[PDB]
Design a protein around this nucleic acid. Sequence first.
RNA 1: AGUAGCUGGUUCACAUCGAAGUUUCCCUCAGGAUAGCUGGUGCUUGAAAAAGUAUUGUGCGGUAAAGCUUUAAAUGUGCAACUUGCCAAAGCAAGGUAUUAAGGCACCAAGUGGGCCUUCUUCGGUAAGCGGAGCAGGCGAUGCGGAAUGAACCGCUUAGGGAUAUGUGGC
RNA 2: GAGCUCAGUGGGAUCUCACGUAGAACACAAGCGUAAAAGCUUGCUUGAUUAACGAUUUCCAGUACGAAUCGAGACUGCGAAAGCAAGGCCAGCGAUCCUUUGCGUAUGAACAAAUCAUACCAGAGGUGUCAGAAUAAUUACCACAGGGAUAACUGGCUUAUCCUUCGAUGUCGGCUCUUCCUAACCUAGCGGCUAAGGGUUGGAUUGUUCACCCACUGACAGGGAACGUGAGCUGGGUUUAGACCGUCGUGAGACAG
RNA 3: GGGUACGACCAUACUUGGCCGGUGCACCACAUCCCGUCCGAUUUGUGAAGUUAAGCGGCCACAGGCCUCGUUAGUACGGCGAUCAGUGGCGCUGGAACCCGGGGUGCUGCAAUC
Lengths: 193, 93, 63, 126, 161, 192
Amino acid sequence: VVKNKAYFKRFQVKYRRRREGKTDYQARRQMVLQDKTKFGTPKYRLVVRITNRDIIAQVVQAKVVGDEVVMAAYSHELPQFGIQHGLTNYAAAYATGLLVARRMLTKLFPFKAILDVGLARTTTGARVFGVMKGAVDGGLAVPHRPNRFPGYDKEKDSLNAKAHRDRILGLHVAEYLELEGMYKKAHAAIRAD
Amino acid sequence: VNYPKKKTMYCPDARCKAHKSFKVVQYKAGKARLYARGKRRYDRKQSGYGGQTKPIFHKKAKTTKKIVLKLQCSNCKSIIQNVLKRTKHFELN
Amino acid sequence: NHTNHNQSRKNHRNGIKRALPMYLHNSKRGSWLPALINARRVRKNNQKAAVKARRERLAAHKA
Amino acid sequence: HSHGYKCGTRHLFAKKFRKHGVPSVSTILTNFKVGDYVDVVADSAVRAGMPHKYYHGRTGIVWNVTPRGVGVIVNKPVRNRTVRKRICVRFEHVRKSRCQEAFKQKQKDFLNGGIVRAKRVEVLAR
Amino acid sequence: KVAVVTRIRGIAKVAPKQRKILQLLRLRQIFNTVFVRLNKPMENMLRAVEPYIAYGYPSLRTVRMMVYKRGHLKINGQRVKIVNNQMIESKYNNENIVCAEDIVNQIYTGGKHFREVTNGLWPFKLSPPAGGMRQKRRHFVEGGDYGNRDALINRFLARMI
Amino acid sequence: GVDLTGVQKKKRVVRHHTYSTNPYIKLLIKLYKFLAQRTNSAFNKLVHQRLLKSRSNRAPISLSRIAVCMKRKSVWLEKGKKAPIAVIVGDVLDDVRMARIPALRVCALRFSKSARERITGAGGECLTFDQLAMVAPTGKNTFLLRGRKSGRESVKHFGAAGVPGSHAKPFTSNRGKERQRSSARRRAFRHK
RNA sequence: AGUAGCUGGUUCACAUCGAAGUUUCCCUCAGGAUAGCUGGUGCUUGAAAAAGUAUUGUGCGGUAAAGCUUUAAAUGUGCAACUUGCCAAAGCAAGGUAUUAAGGCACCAAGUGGGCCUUCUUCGGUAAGCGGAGCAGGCGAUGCGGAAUGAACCGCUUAGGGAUAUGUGGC
RNA sequence: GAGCUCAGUGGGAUCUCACGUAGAACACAAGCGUAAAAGCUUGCUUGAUUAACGAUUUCCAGUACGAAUCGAGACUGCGAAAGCAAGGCCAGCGAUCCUUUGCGUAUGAACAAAUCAUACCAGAGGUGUCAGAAUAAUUACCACAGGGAUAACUGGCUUAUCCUUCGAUGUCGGCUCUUCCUAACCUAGCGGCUAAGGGUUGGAUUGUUCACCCACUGACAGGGAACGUGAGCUGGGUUUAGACCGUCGUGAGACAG
RNA sequence: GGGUACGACCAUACUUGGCCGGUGCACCACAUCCCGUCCGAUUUGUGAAGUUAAGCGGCCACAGGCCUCGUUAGUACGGCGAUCAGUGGCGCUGGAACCCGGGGUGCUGCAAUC
Ligand SMILES: [Mg+2]
Ligand SMILES: [Mg+2]
Ligand SMILES: [Mg+2]
Ligand SMILES: [Mg+2]
Ligand SMILES: [Mg+2]
Ligand SMILES: [Mg+2]
Ligand SMILES: [Mg+2]
Ligand SMILES: [Mg+2]
Ligand SMILES: [Mg+2]
Ligand SMILES: [Mg+2]
Ligand SMILES: [Mg+2]
Ligand SMILES: [Mg+2]
Ligand SMILES: [Mg+2]
Ligand SMILES: [Mg+2]
Ligand SMILES: [Mg+2]
Ligand SMILES: [Mg+2]
Ligand SMILES: [Mg+2]
Ligand SMILES: [Mg+2]
Ligand SMILES: [Mg+2]
Ligand SMILES: [Zn+2]
């Protein structure tokens, strides 16, 4: 028996939120880390999550009490802006993040949150990078390189923005399925915010 | 210790100020030339009837020694040179 | 032989001298440089306004 | 006969039982302005910037903050004098002090015997 | 709220911790005496050197005899025998402390100037107890001499004064 | 039968009599010993103790350094207040680096022939401690000064040179003898 | 008049203070240099940067005990009483308008660098008046009183004397 | 950087599933630490570069060497990113002189260029006795300055120490003579016990002691007295120089043979 | 009151096995493309038919563990003292742990949300 009484003595429970499986902490401890020389001036973090039904973009900064969630842009609120369908697709992530990026500047050299992928694999064109590219294009100075935008070829080190633009506009789902105009119309309608 | 036959180490030259592949050559000490300032002394001091006049080190204890690596960017002649750890068998490839 | 006997006695003869006060050898120097350099820019400006201040006090004192 | 930098640290740098693991976010979000008191309690999980050993548990003021390190002035009794040491330290190894928390509480607040009528009373004899 | 501590062993062979506490008690000789009020911090000093001292809780009479008979002010660093109340008011520039009766109240009632008073007194230089001690090595309750002996110090300290 | 531990270490070493063989110092100590005791003034107590010092510890002052320290003192004085006498218990030396000086009223044990002439070329008096006592029996607006002694070349030798913090001057008849390659040297700076 | 890190000797008094047998280094181990200890000279000013001590507050610890290599003492141990970076930015940062007790600093310099005993703690050794350490105290360098006697036990430590009273020890 | 999870156990067929607090691995001893990892695979890589003489820690004398930490500048590497990296944590290494190599001007002093050499500067060649002379024996023919800081010896302690003694305390034995002890051999008295009184032999071998033998004897007991006793002796043992042999040694010479 | 995200402390929140059940969460559908595997299992992208079985969360273990306090225990050990006794008491003092038992079995922060 591996899990006898001696086992639960010497056993050290991992952190609740790792034990819960909900967070990487080598990343949390680096995402959060900033130069001590900075006496503690804010370091915002664009945490972004793809709950299987709906996207969640959330500008955030760490605190000892528990990190403040300064602003957030759930995909649920997309339909409020005319996106009635595909509220978890890459075409939507761009507008979710572009939304938080625009709802965050609405309070406010560019604002500089950094992306917090959490556990999502950073394969090219992953939806998480659509939240960035949306939010990054929406105002926030999220540091990044085009390497994981869709339409960025590994071989040939260059993005295909004429292709990256497509999936942003929902042409992505066109061929799997007139929408392209409801996103450009979607975007003016979130800047109307 | 196998060592790369070429390395993109950083270059101090104005022409560079950049990483460049460097043609690695091992540093072998140059010939001890006769008219070195201090060979002329030793020779003058070995003239005459005192036998040996300076100590001759005999008992080595080191089996290995630091392997200085002369380098030189393709761009120019200048030879940056840098030390490694002691090894019994340095051999670049 | 290595006995440490009579050492704390011999040491407390002239006391353990307590460490220097923080207001003395408070050199920076090897301080994280970028802060250290901005500090010079301020201290140099403190000097120009200290001297400029005394020039004021004298002109004020010609009355 | 063999005093290297971490002689006799088999217990000193051990993590406490069931309290292993690298320092958390509460650690990382602590910040050190210069002249702050601190405790150089070395944490083994972090190896870069670890304090010697003498400096373990010593208190001192920060004299210096670099991006990942906290310079700390820590008195060392060398002989008849306390030499005033300048250990460099990664911020994980520095637990901020409460050594003055009482005194700060004070200037925060700066801002006999009689009849005992007791009735239970057992005899004390063996 | 006041013990009349009395150094009772001599100055030889005493350890660095006891040796410091005795200096801070100003018990630098044998039958020196001082009045120290019983703070916890003092009760922990006295507990550190009890084999070197006898003490207890002086009676008002014990206080009179020491201050009147053995009482000596520090004056310009001079050890000055009390003789005038003039002598006392000059030492203690304190509208409170004028009488030699001011002194005895301070070093007995526990005083607000118990330090202001007892410090301006040279520590008392008592003679060895007449009729002898018992054993300067054992604690008083062991049938010896050192350590707290409560109110009984007045007897012991009476033979000395 | 007494703890004496730490009593002897607190004993201070002070001069209580001048080692000077000079008769005039002794008439001058005779004065200020008296004047220091019979007056309440702290000035007489300083002139009297300094007067007991070594000529080492009575460092000379530049007349240049009096003119500086004096005007710097007197410039603030409210109008109609004549400047303080510039007493020094030491020699006063002329300074070539300050050709023109204010009508100072310096008072010192001794003056260089150059200091005395520049001092009077400015119209300032060059009075002694005798009439200092007769004009300022108390240190009434005297301005007691000291000559410098840190720039003294003896103290440039203090400490070791080889010790890393230090910038002591090594003792050497030969300046080039202990010269050294930049590589081999002690670290210049070092925190205390 | 070789040299001797060795052996032996080195001539008045009194007063003032008064060690070390340890650190690093050395073809160093019977010696140096170095630092400490000590003296002298000051300097500087007078609860300055006082403390072989507590209390209080805050860290540190993993030995005894415990336990079956883990919890955890006591004795300890630390500490305290406008201009110019960062931030998205003007806000943050930085520099500026209890008892007792004289504190600090400098200089020059000696002797010393065989220690010993004991207390407690140990390590090695079958054991030792044995080798080795930790702590403190001693002898060394110091009598005096006491243990009949004793370098270091006990008491007490000491200017020349008297009275008194004691300490350890006695009657 | 990313992905991953391990040692082992168990269920099935190298594989598969489960559990699996690290019980594995992490060049190298050991400790430490470590789990979406610091381990394992994987990809891209050269931060194992340069680093304006920055400061620090360890050793410490608060010197260095080494090692390490916090840094800044450059140029990078990886990574979406924050970040991380100036080797592989921690042991793995070294002055002056000299040689040598590099690097960017300087000197070769009447002048000038080239050569040569030197210099600055930064590495390297090494001192392992590792803060760094370049170093075989022997002496019984020996010698000196010392040392009881240090052997034998001499007493002490213990059951080896190094306390006394090296400006010297004569070694083993015997002989000689005395003396004391008793866990008594004989004798005496008892019934093993008491008993120190008096006695305890002569010889062969061997220096001996010791042992063993022969003979006697009532018996042939054991010990102390500086292993009693050398200004008492003797000098056999030990025994310096001479010499011989064996062994050892290239040899001079060594051997408790 | 609950659900989500990001959390701080990191077992009172852990392990096991139960039962319990509106936003969402989840599982779930397919993989055309971005992207990645022996395999879309993982991962990635695209969905919204299904279900809560699970996960999740909440309640139960004469559950183990963990936490808490008491018992242990003024015990162990310890500092100081004695011209103490012959390891131990004593005087002055500091003072546990294992164990067993009672209790307990997460809590707080930001954001949008039923
Ligand atoms: Mg990550
Ligand atoms: Mg020695
Ligand atoms: Mg520990
Ligand atoms: Mg008695
Ligand atoms: Mg005693
Ligand atoms: Mg000068
Ligand atoms: Mg004295
Ligand atoms: Mg000698
Ligand atoms: Mg233990
Ligand atoms: Mg034990
Ligand atoms: Mg006697
Ligand atoms: Mg990883
Ligand atoms: Mg430097
Ligand atoms: Mg170094
Ligand atoms: Mg290393
Ligand atoms: Mg050496
Ligand atoms: Mg000896
Ligand atoms: Mg004999
Ligand atoms: Mg004889
Ligand atoms: Zn180049």
